Write a protein that binds this DNA or RNA. Structure first.
Ligand SMILES: C[C@H](COCC(CO)(COC[C@@H](C)OC[C@@H](C)O)COC[C@@H](C)O)OC[C@@H](C)O
Ligand code: NA
Length: 361
DNA sequence: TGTCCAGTCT
DNA sequence: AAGACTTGGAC
């Protein structure tokens, strides 16, 4: 097993931070910083450790906020880790609330060394309109890291941060940010636009569908964003979403040989889903082929869980074998329970057949 | 609770 | 990525 992520902020890293702080600030209280940062370190998760570094710096540095920021600007290029550098935007969000313009400039600078995606959300929470205006300017910045921040920091449902209830409730607030970026030349930016849009589909699917129905999907950057923005709705079999992908029509196919083997497994074994699709159409057709498992849970069953299989074009009268092995074992993100597990085959949003496997007690 | 979603490794 | 997740938010 690899070391846990929290070990990125181990004592050796804290010593590195202190040494580089001494390099930019000879009078730095490195001993006090280390004492403060190390207290209970083993009990701290990775994001607790990240925050702790910022707090420890604030506790021992006898300078004001602008003066400390000057040191931290010099510290940023000396750090040997982009993830570790998250404590720099954290310091701004913690101590910069009453020095807004300076703090915004600091986040724009620091975000290239890691990411200001967590820090900017504290400002969006406490000063939404003021911060939104800044992020609109950032969406037009020359630097792809700054444009990406504009999209990622404003996400309704960013992992490892609180949801932004104000954004989540009103997709028009950030709409112009995403519109500016819908054909961005940066893959980094495009990923963020797509993920922000996928977030929106959890609460306002029709708004995203209407938006993308207005897009020019002949632009391959925009088409790529559309496919990844709509990925949850596609798995749900949403007809408007599948239609945007060219796979909204009912599949003109027959399914043959559908099976799941073995019929009965112990936890830890693999299942094998296989079937053949035969076109019954006079021309090629675009297909989105997924599958779903109805897992047995501690009580009852979970909602059908959809996994991706294949997206492809099936020639007229052609047939295509499809096969997927899946390793069924307890995982951090899924515990399993014994009984009948039903597997459904999905083609352009339609269930075309099912099979079963038994998970033994 | 248990459950589900979500740049790097795989 | 496409899925799990070293980890975290939320229901
Ligand atoms: C915080 C982001 C993403 O983190 C990715 C890494 C990947 O292992 C940790 O994911 C752990 C996983 C359990 O979580 C899932 C994601 C969805 O949260 C950390 O990256 C390690 C290298 C960079 O040190 O990255 C911020 C940026 C400043 O790096
Ligand atoms: Na990984």
């Amino acid at each position: 097993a690899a070391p846990a992520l929290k070990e990125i902020f181990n004592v050796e890293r804290l010593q590195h931070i202190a040494s580089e702080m001494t390099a930019v600030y000879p009078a730095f209280d490195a001993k006090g910083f280390l004492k403060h940062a190390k207290a209970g370190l083993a009990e701290l998760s990775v994001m607790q450790r990240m925050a702790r570094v910022s707090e420890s710096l604030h506790a021992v540095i006898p300078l004001d906020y602008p003066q400390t920021l000057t040191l931290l600007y010099a510290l940023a290029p000396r750090l040997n880790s982009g993830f570790v550098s998250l404590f720099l935007p954290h310091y701004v969000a913690s101590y910069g609330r009453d020095d807004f313009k300076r703090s915004m400039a600091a986040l724009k600078y620091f975000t290239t060394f890691g990411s200001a995606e967590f820090a900017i959300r504290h400002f969006l929470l406490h000063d939404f309109q003021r911060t939104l205006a800044v992020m609109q300017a950032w969406s037009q910045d020359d630097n792809e890291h700054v444009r990406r921040l504009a999209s990622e920091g404003s996400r309704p449902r960013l992992p490892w941060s609180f949801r932004l209830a104000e954004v989540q409730a009103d997709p028009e607030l950030c709409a112009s940010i995403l519109d500016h970026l819908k054909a961005d030349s940066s893959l980094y930016v495009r990923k963020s636009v797509a993920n922000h849009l996928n977030d929106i589909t959890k609460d306002h699917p029709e708004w995203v569908l209407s938006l993308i129905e207005g897009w020019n999907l002949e632009n391959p950057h925009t088409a790529w964003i559309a496919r990844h923005a709509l990925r949850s709705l596609i798995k749900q079999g949403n007809t408007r979403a599948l239609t945007l992908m060219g796979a909204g029509a009912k599949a003109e196919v027959k399914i043959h040989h559908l099976m799941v083997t073995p019929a009965v497994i112990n936890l830890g074994e693999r299942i094998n889903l296989s079937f053949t699709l035969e076109s019954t159409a006079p021309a090629p057709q675009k297909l989105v082929v997924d599958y779903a498992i109805d897992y047995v849970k501690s009580t009852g069953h979970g909602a059908a869980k959809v996994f991706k299989l294949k997206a492809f074009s099936l020639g007229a009268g052609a047939q295509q074998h499809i096969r997927r092995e899946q390793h069924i074992r307890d995982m951090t993100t899924r515990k399993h329970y014994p009984g009948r597990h039903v597997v459904h085959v999905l083609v352009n949003g339609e269930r075309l057949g099912s099979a079963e496997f038994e998970l033994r007690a």
